[PDB]
Design a protein around this ligand. Structure first.
Ligand SMILES: O=P(O)(O)OC[C@H]1O[C@](O)(CO)[C@@H](O)[C@@H]1O
Ligand SMILES: O=P(O)(O)OC[C@H]1O[C@](O)(CO)[C@@H](O)[C@@H]1O
Lengths: 556, 556
């Protein structure tokens, strides 16, 4: 398919033709480049905006035009409309992909199975509203008459990463009183930690499971339920109704949540068309909404919804996530770059790169197309990154002087939470300079000039130059926001969510399944029973057998 | 140079010839493969060992032999001996590279500038011994007569990452009483956090600076010094000698540390031949030695020293870090793989991948050779990873079904800190299965078989198969340790340190300089003054100007 599309053949030819042209050459030609290769979205509240500047790239107009034609030829916009209308675009699982519904502020009806799913979203949202308002107000009391000061979220993967990244990002909008803890480990270690950290009389446990029997998570949950029960009993406090005051559920399995001791009025549902890596917007986000409250969660949802609207209605050339996706395709698929750095210059976004690893690589780390049959081109790249400043006395050495071309998203804010201090100006001088540095480089001649002005030996100058030269012509996107509020954050996540949709559409893959984990799960089930003192296995390959056999002969 | 070496030409030819041969084919041929492609190091204490199993790779004997011949031809072993003997192998800075001295337990004399540096190492070690013993015993008192229960380390980069990774890794060997905090940010945010978290009467601040005037760090340090002074004054406690009881220095600038109020008997020195990313072994490691105490730090140093000895004396074919480096070169330089995953199945090692990003990419992310002139081949790869279990409901999808070949180091322990519970067996069943999964894959035919046994529709089977197939033939190293003690940890870091030495030697680069950060620093200095309300700049390129101008017109 894709290897024989005119539009891709056209891009090959332009990569061959203009690929070696320095980034700086495209600025020397036209003096409005910054303007023509940047997009600003009005976030429609409080002077906030989301702005992408993709100017610092190996892309001219002929290329930019070829990239937009690829997206038309692949029918990206139409595939998106169908997703947005509840079509079962998750082909291999036969389901809708409706994270857009979870933040559909306008209540545009969306029909799955002869029902408007917005009924259900708005019902669970309004259920969360009433619940969180009652916890955050003080009115909800644990078994002894005390208000709640801790929330411990139980689960793993997309049931942990989202809530973690988002409550971190938004600490300045959060009730500082109630501490949030996130337990993801199979061993009870992190759970035991938090139980010897919290007063159980002032705490709620969130259990995140759709069937509400899932073995790992329901284990860590019983750790809590058992500690709660042991604690009441020793101190002469009755257990009657007690789990109902210290436990809530993110689930559909009404009677099994009720058997567990939870009041089903406190079972916050979500649906099969909410994928794990697209779930913070749903009831999975309950810990976020506890932490920052309802109005702020609605702002978060709204900033996403503003991004959905921008993405659905805006023609490709001016369409922010589309252009984001398309510069990523230029690098991933024609330059052959294997990686994507995400570098937020705001310490609150410190967990954003990890989140974007889940979202991007779990979605687009695929080898086959929907129609089935191997992909003919590179799919998703390896996402990495750390929060700005930090990475700078680390792996920036390599982005700058190494032999790998790596696309970098620099993300930053115009304003700072702390109005007074010089901290922020200094930080943003680095944010602009790094992308400037990557593009322009520093010449043999410029270095020579400097080293002469330092009065270097006439001799140890010619052999020193090359260590201090930078090539430049290394790409970077600069992404800015006026301020990192809930709503800006929601727009940033949604932007990446649709960047991912767009890349996977163009490649022909299903972005919304995850069959890649199955193999490891099945081979582990078959190994567990073989782990016993003195046992030798022979039924695997030699390495697996050796390793297993070393474990069996040396453990306890 | 390197492009015209017989040994490299030989490897190209073998990549072309055997590159497509499945990993599993090398097991079918010989039944002892596991044994012949694995190395065990005796760590000489407590049944502990460090073991590398590199069998699951696209390497046969002809290749393995070509790779060892590359290392001989490049004179890796001789370059290492010179480094170990205090030769100035850091060419561009004209200095020794002597992190091996810092853990030279045997006291093999090493001469830099007509002096045995071991005099100085052992003196600072014995200074740290006496100091930490006195803090950890209770005997050191803050200004009010109280023992110390907090340690706050101040600095960034290699002055933060090492201490952080290592105290995390070794929490089970640590005084649980004294909390450790690590401040790396330029904005005072994280510093203010820790000052409203600690009682100043029971705390020591570690300041990590060689000149002891370095502006950022000395700022955050004065935040602490100023808070200390303000606190005594309000509560009617004298300031006489008070900074001397609450502050210590990691530095050489004796009189400037003394001007700051610190007792120079408490100035813990280190040397210019200790690079930042190789510094935890030195006095930079003071917070580690506080946390776990002297005997444990010596065990840490010793495990490294055991690794140095193994690395210096063991012929290449049986030499663990050499073979590690060489399989990494096979993938990085012939397969063209841009990345390196490090995946520790032990939650205590959760910060190891970040550390290894600094170490690897800051060392080997270079574009020029020592003799000067551009490198003809790919140098360091992009390191990423997270701790086992976690990553598994994330980006494992991509390692398994994506279109990028990525070398994975799986690192694990035979034993667990908590003797009773099933947690650990379950974890290691995943550790073995993942590398098994990556190698063997799951066939069109095997999947068909399963889906038939599930009674799938006869029809939605042929189009479903390919989504559930795995290709296999994806490499993995399995690295095991009997137990993650201080000494095993030290052996693991040193192993990677020498893997890095070996790769950079083969490529011709200086692994021990870091000129790649300079450009950004200089362009930031020049931008800072341009950041002012209403100011327009025109002296940069358009993107930089635009971005700056947007900031200036929209900030406060
Ligand atoms: O919904 P179940 O049956 O409990 O399992 C699904 C859950 O497991 C996870 O994959 C891991 O906790 C979550 O993302 C998800 O909510
Ligand atoms: O030793 P100075 O002059 O204070 O600056 C060096 C220090 O700065 C850092 O790069 C950052 O804190 C450390 O690695 C190092 O110890």
């Amino acid at each position: 398919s894709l290897l024989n599309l005119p539009a891709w053949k056209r891009l090959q030819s332009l990569y061959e033709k203009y690929g070696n042209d320095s980034i700086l050459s495209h600025f020397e030609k036209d003096h409005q480049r910054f303007q023509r290769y940047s997009i600003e979205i009005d976030l429609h509240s409080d002077d906030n905006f989301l702005f992408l500047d993709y100017s610092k790239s190996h892309i001219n107009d002929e290329i930019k035009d070829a990239l937009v034609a690829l997206a038309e030829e692949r029918g990206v916009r139409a595939f998106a409309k169908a997703m947005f209308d509840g079509q079962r675009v998750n082909s291999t699982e036969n389901r809708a992909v409706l994270h857009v519904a979870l933040r559909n502020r306008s209540n545009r009806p969306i029909i799955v199975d002869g029902k408007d799913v917005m009924s259900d979203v708005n019902n669970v949202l309004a259920q969360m509203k009433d619940f969180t308002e009652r916890v955050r107000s003080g009115e909800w009391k644990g078994q002894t008459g005390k208000s709640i000061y801790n929330i411990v979220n139980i689960g793993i993967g997309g049931s942990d990463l989202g809530p973690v990244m988002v409550t971190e990002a938004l600490k300045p909008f959060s009730k500082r009183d109630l501490h949030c803890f996130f337990v993801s480990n199979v061993d009870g270690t992190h759970m035991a930690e938090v139980l010897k950290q919290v007063n159980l009389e002032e705490t709620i446990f969130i259990i995140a499971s759709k069937t509400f029997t899932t073995q790992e998570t329901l284990t860590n949950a019983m750790s809590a339920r058992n500690a709660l029960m042991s604690y009441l009993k020793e101190n002469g406090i009755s257990t009657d109704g007690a789990v109902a005051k210290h436990f809530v559920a993110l689930s559909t399995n009404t009677e099994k949540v009720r058997e567990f001791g939870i009041d089903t009025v406190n079972m916050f549902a979500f649906w099969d068309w909410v994928g794990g890596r697209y779930s913070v917007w749903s009831a999975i986000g309950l810990s976020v909404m506890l932490s920052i409250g309802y109005d702020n969660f609605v702002e978060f949802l709204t900033g996403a919804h503003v991004m959905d609207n921008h993405f659905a209605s805006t023609p490709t050339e001016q369409n922010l996530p589309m252009m984001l996706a398309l510069v990523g395709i230029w690098y991933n698929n024609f330059f052959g770059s294997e990686t994507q750095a995400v570098l937020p210059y705001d310490q609150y976004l410190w967990r954003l790169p990890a989140y974007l690893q889940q979202l991007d690589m779990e979605s687009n780390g695929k080898g086959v197309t929907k129609k089935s049959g191997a992909v003919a081109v590179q799919t998703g790249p390896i996402v990495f990154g750390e929060a700005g400043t930090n990475g700078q006395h680390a792996f920036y050495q390599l982005i700058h002087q190494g032999t790998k071309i790596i696309p970098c998203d620099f993300i930053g804010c115009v304003q700072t939470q702390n109005r007074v201090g010089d901290h922020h100006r200094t930080l943003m001088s680095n944010f602009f300079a790094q992308t400037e540095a990557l593009m322009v480089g520093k010449n043999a001649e410029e270095v020579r000039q400097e080293l002469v002005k330092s009065g270097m030996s006439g001799d140890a100058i010619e052999n020193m130059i090359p260590h201090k030269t930078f090539t430049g012509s290394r790409p970077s996107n600069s992404i800015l926001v006026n301020a990192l509020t809930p709503r800006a954050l929601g727009a940033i996540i949604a932007m990446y969510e649709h960047k991912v949709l767009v890349q996977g559409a163009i490649w022909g893959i299903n972005s919304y399944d995850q069959w890649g984990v199955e193999l490891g799960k099945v081979l582990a089930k078959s190994i567990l029973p073989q782990l016993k003192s003195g046992n030798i296995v022979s039924d695997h390959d030699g390495s697996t057998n050796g390793l297993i056999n070393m474990f069996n002969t040396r453990a306890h």
